[PDB]
Amino acid sequence: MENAHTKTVEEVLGHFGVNESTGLSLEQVKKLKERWGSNELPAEEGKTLLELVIEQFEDLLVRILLLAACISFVLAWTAFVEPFVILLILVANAIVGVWQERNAENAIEALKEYEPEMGKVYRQDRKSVQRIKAKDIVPGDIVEIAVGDKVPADIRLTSIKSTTLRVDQSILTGESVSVIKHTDPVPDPRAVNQDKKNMLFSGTNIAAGKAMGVVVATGVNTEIGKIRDEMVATEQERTPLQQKLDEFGEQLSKVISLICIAVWIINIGHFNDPWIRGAIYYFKIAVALAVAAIPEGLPAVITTCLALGTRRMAKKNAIVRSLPSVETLGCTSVICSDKTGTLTTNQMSVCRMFILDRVSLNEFTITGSTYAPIGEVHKDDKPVNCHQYDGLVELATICALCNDSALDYNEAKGVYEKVGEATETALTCLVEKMNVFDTELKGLSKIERANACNSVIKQLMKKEFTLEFSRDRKSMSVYCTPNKPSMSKMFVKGAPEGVIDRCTHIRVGSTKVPMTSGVKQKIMSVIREWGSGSDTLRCLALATHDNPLRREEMHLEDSANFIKYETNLTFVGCVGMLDPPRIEVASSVKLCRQAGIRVIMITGDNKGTAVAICRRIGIFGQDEDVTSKAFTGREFDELNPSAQRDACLNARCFARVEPSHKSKIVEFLQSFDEITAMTGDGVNDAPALKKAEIGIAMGSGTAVAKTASEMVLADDNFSTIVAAVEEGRAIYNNMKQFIRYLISSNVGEVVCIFLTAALGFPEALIPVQLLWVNLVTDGLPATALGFNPPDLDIMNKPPRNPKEPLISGWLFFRYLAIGCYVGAATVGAAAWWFIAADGGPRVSFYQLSHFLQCDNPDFEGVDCAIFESPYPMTMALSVLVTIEMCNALNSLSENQSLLRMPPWENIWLVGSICLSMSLHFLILYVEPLPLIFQITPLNVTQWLMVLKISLPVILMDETLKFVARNYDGISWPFVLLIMPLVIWVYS
Ligand code: BEF
Ligand SMILES: [Mg+2]
């Protein structure tokens, strides 16, 4: 059974062999369940923990360091510690990542429903209806639907028991109003879900109807199943941050290979016949170079900064489901959106209402955009005590009495939920907000305040019967008699032009006057203005009967009597309600436009309500033309390629689109080379939440949209998006700062190794020393720089370029030059202990390179064994550590030097610098640690010489910042504080 909206009832009955009155036998349901399967969707289709580490260990630099470590194991035939420690980091920066991907999930199913929906099915085993599970339903079952029931599977309606059927498909098609159904089939075979007015869909609940139908699809063949299939079929690429990091790692591998082949070419010119006894030094220098040219602490500090960003975002009720998705909202330029459920509260609510005061209209405006009865009334200002207006009392009566829906507090959710029609619920919450009898709303509880006003207004009035909302009359009536008394009233609510034409009287307060044409044209004009301009509403005319016909002759069997008896009515007023946008979007869209981020609203509703809400929230103006900024599904499908391109580049409101259409729009926007960020809550945004870069979902949305997303706004707030944009921008700035710092340090170490290897000097930096430096002494300052203060106007400039590099061009020179100097300094330190060491062997300047052979004494230099003393290695390590402390101290801002920003402005940076220095002193004076590698505590004059060698790096980088920025001052505290520190070392 492909589709049943084209075939009649008898057709599908013969196709399924099921009779409506009897039901299905046990053999039939058993065979259907074995052929089609259970009515349930799979669970998250995911992978366990045993494969995430293999997925995360596929990068390039990780393989380079693995090759270096395996070469180290080979040459390490006396316990070796160099290749082991780094492995621990490979477990520290990975598991934590996994710890995120699980934890976020633990924060999603916490706000999910726990009730398994049931279903009323007629089967041949029993005579009455059977309440069974939602999974054992098979195509062919006679399912009965009532008010408030959630449809369990795709159903083709067969018999509408009630006079009408209202279905709320806002979950699937985004329609804000309850759709009316009809048993008649639609001949359109390829009709959209908004055209099949004889079918039902899973998840969509019945608003105010009741009927019986046959099942057509189930499980995966249903609409939600097809959506989940299209969602899981779509692919999700990597975030731009990870792409930049991968490009940078590729460049790093390239430069490592280049410097390694350079060292190889330089070294092969001396040694011949690759001897294998001396080739161990070549492999040692190669692994030392390969580990010095790898920022082992960079992935750890990046994961730390991303985890801190996620911890900061989770305070805004935004569960982020991955680490690198915090920066994805930093470079985003477009933010797609959904009208129903995301921008609008999806809860119909009244905004204004007018009565007539012709001895002139009195128009009040109601505040509130949800189902919570905590709103207020406003005429112009000064919230009016509504007990004075007798006409408003009559309006409250005529509206609250003619109702069938209600509100109730759900303690499991914590929000007033509707039961029944949405529009009648908006009207009853109007009643609850506007109390004409001045009842108390402070001491009573919430579950009772949900209907206190309506129960009070229903005490003195006993509803006799109800004339249901018909099609041609398009107005519903209620006959009621006032309790504790000629005394009888018949209330009517309906379409404006469908009631005024039958309204032959006018109720000015408590005075009933005949009908005049002037006030009729006036109210008709004001109603046509209320629901056709930039503030289109849903108007409801209200009229009561002065002399209702008696009940003994009132016949409720014929359809024509519903209109014949509804004559000689008097107008009481009108009500205007709509699907209101959230109170935190009108300003957030402006704050997001200031940041140069365009906001598009893609939805499946009609273009009228879409453009109305789009004007109301602030994307358009009350008079702005929308001829080229408001497209329909058919309109977008009937455009040439260039037309579609300029549309998706200029349009800002798409209405009447399918989920596949949303995916098409998102992939067009991404084809325009710009990061997108789609939000949504329904089972229609899921195919387009995965296609987007950072798919955002709402906390009150559906499970499919929350599982096809990378963020879940639990509080449904929309300013959380701009907060996350700001946080992502700050995170990226800090990240590109500390990555450049780490790379400068690494290039310094690498040029030190290259110089000490090409010149011929003995080893000055062994790998394990580089491991410890790059891990601790480089991660503490990097983690400190990850807390840089945000820019004063970070949210006032257009989004970042998608192709900008982490290592700028000219800047790549800067952090190279200083870096090179670092290397030299380190080498110098070693050379110092071989030249001007007062307690060291002053080896000849031309015989220091020839150290591998010096063993017999052939010259004045003797003791050819001190060349492995811990003192030169300690000099090099100490000067490198202090030069990196100075580099991290001055790398606090991008362009402005220290003479325009003090280093103690970022207290975390100076704190981490002091901690790293005290830890470097802690590794000298302690007993067992200086025994792992080859170091030794230094003298006072040696430390002073190291400081004298390493301090000019700050002067070099200051003057380089100056010459890069140039093409009064705050130096007084600088020349007050740092002057003794510099004048004390040169005396
Ligand atoms: F929920 Be949206 F209107 F597609
Ligand atoms: Mg929605």
Residue 631: name the closest of 660, 662, 591 by CA: 662
Q: Does residue 341 have its Cβ closer than 6 Å to ligand 1?
A: yes
How many angstroms separate the CA atoms of 151 and 170, rounded?
A: 13
The CATH code that applies to domain 241-307+728-791+805-983 is 1.20.1110.10
How many angstroms separate the CA atoms of 657 and 663, rounded?
A: 10
How many angstroms separate the CA atoms of 42 and 20, rounded?
A: 31
Q: Do residues 785 and 892 make contact, with C-beta atoms less than 8 angstroms apart?
A: yes
How many angstroms separate the CA atoms of 570 and 560, rounded?
A: 21
Q: Does residue 309 have its Cβ closer than 6 Å to ligand 1?
A: no
613 C-alpha to ligand 1 centroid (Å): 13
How many angstroms separate the CA atoms of 220 and 228, rounded?
A: 8
How many angstroms separate the CA atoms of 253 and 563, rounded?
A: 84
What three-state secondary structure class fits 417? strand
Q: Does CATH place domain 318-343+583-716 in 3.30.70.260?
A: no
297 C-alpha to ligand 1 centroid (Å): 44
Q: What's the token pair of residue 378?
A: 């406003």
Q: What's the token pair of residue 714?
A: 């639990």
CA distances from 66 to 97, 242, 321, 774, 775 (A): 20, 21, 30, 17, 17
Q: Does residue 684 have its Cβ closer than 6 Å to ligand 1?
A: yes
Q: What are phi and psi of 43, to 5 degrees?
A: -115, 90
Strand spans (E) along 647-775: 653-655, 679-680, 696-698, 711-713
Strand spans (E) along 607-657: 631-632, 653-655
Residue intervals of the chain classified under CATH 3.40.1110.10 are: 349-578
How many angstroms separate the CA atoms of 38 and 220, rounded?
A: 10
* Nearest ligand for residue 688 CA: 1
How many angstroms separate the CA atoms of 623 and 533, rounded?
A: 9
CA distances from 746 to 88, 100, 252, 385, 826 (A): 20, 29, 11, 74, 13
Residue 171: name the closest of 676, 700, 632 by CA: 700
Residue intervals of the chain classified under CATH 3.40.50.1000 are: 318-343+583-716
- The three state secondary structure string of 835-868 is HCCCCCCCCCCCCCCCCCCCCCCCCCCCCCCHHH
How many angstroms separate the CA atoms of 877 and 202, rounded?
A: 68
Question: 349-578: which CATH architecture?
Answer: 3-Layer(aba) Sandwich (3.40)
How many angstroms separate the CA atoms of 571 and 512, rounded?
A: 9
**567 contacts: CB under 8 Å, gap ≥ 6:** 502, 504
> CA Rg, the chain, in Å?
38
Q: Does residue 605 have its Cβ closer than 6 Å to ligand 1?
A: yes
Bridge partners for 514 per DSSP = 505
Q: Does residue 339 have its Cβ closer than 6 Å to ligand 1?
A: yes
Pairing of strands 711-713, 696-698: parallel
Q: Does residue 603 have its Cβ closer than 6 Å to ligand 1?
A: yes
- Which residue has the CA at smallest separation from atom 4 of ligand 1? 603
Segment holding 569, helix H or strand E: strand 569-578
Q: Does residue 581 have its Cβ closer than 6 Å to ligand 1?
A: no
The CATH code that applies to domain 9-36+113-219 is 2.70.150.10
Work out which ligand 1 atom sits closest to the CA atom of 342: 1
- Map tokens 């140069």 to a residue: 596
CA distances from 428 to 76, 362, 420, 422, 594 (A): 82, 21, 11, 10, 39
Work out which ligand 1 atom sits closest to the CA atom of 681: 1
Q: Do residues 13 and 212 make contact, with C-beta atoms less than 8 angstroms apart?
A: no
How many angstroms separate the CA atoms of 205 and 533, rounded?
A: 31
Of 665, 684, 706, the one to substitute when testing ligand 1's pocket (max ligand atoms within 8 A of C-beta) is 684
How many angstroms separate the CA atoms of 855 and 868, rounded?
A: 14
From the candidates 141, 338, 685, 716, which is the catalytic residue? 338
What three-state secondary structure class fits 409? strand
Determine how many CB atoms are found less than 10 A away from the CB of residue 84: 14
Determine how many CB atoms are found less than 10 A away from the CB of residue 502: 17
Q: Do residues 895 and 811 make contact, with C-beta atoms less than 8 angstroms apart?
A: no
Is the CA virtual torsion 152, 153, 154, 160 positive or negative? Answer: negative
How many CA atoms lie less than 13 Å away from 658 in the CB half-sphere? Answer: 18
Helices 940-950 and 809-835, packing angle to 10 deg: 150
Q: Do residues 757 and 684 make contact, with C-beta atoms less than 8 angstroms apart?
A: no
What three-state secondary structure class fits 377? strand
What three-state secondary structure class fits 887? helix
380 is catalytic: no
Of 175, 192, 343, 603, the one to substitute when testing ligand 1's pocket (max ligand atoms within 8 A of C-beta) is 603
Residue 650: name the closest of 634, 663, 669, 637 by CA: 669
Angle at 949 between CA 948 and CA 951, to 5 degrees: 65
How many angstroms separate the CA atoms of 629 and 771, rounded?
A: 58
- Which residue has the CA at smallest separation from atom 1 of ligand 1? 174
- Map tokens 């759709």 to a residue: 179
How many angstroms separate the CA atoms of 473 and 566, rounded?
A: 9
Work out which ligand 1 atom sits closest to the CA atom of 338: 2
How many angstroms separate the CA atoms of 693 and 666, rounded?
A: 9
Q: Does residue 749 have its Cβ closer than 6 Å to ligand 1?
A: no
How many CA atoms lie less than 13 Å away from 599 in the CB half-sphere? Answer: 25
How many angstroms separate the CA atoms of 142 and 268, rounded?
A: 86
How many angstroms separate the CA atoms of 165 and 868, rounded?
A: 91
Bridge partners for 535 per DSSP = none
How many angstroms separate the CA atoms of 819 and 451, rounded?
A: 73
316 C-alpha to ligand 1 centroid (Å): 24
Residue 677: name the closest of 665, 686, 664, 689 by CA: 689
930 C-alpha to ligand 1 centroid (Å): 65
How many angstroms separate the CA atoms of 309 and 975, rounded?
A: 37
Residue 756: name the closest of 855, 826, 663 by CA: 826
Is the CA virtual torsion 189, 195, 200, 201 positive or negative? Answer: positive
Q: Do residues 351 and 537 make contact, with C-beta atoms less than 8 angstroms apart?
A: yes
Q: What's the token pair of residue 598?
A: 């365009």
Bridge partners for 601 per DSSP = 653
How many angstroms separate the CA atoms of 901 and 892, rounded?
A: 8
Residues, the chain: 987
Q: What's the token pair of residue 184?
A: 């008649």
DSSP string, 113-145: --PPPEEEEE-TT-SS-EEEESSS--TT-EEEE
Separation of first and last alpha carbons in the chain:
96
CA distances from 343 to 259, 314, 652 (A): 55, 21, 14
DSSP state, residue 264: H
Q: What's the token pair of residue 269?
A: 């010119």
Q: Which residues are annotated as a binding site for ATP?
A: 340, 424, 471, 493, 538, 603-605, 656, 662, 684
Pairing of strands 211-215, 601-602: unpaired
Strand spans (E) along 169-256: 179-180, 199-200, 205-206, 211-215
Work out which ligand 1 atom sits closest to the CA atom of 680: 1
Q: Do residues 315 and 535 make contact, with C-beta atoms less than 8 angstroms apart?
A: no
Work out which ligand 1 atom sits closest to the CA atom of 659: 4
Residue intervals of the chain classified under CATH 2.70.150.10 are: 9-36+113-219
Q: What is the largest CA-CA distance in the chain?
A: 136
How many angstroms separate the CA atoms of 874 and 777, rounded?
A: 15
Is the CA virtual torsion 655, 658, 662, 667 positive or negative? Answer: negative
DSSP state, residue 775: I
Determine how many CB atoms are found less than 10 A away from the CB of residue 469: 20
Ligand 2 (single-atom ion) residues, CB below 5 Å:
338, 340-341, 681-682
* Nearest ligand for residue 657 CA: 1
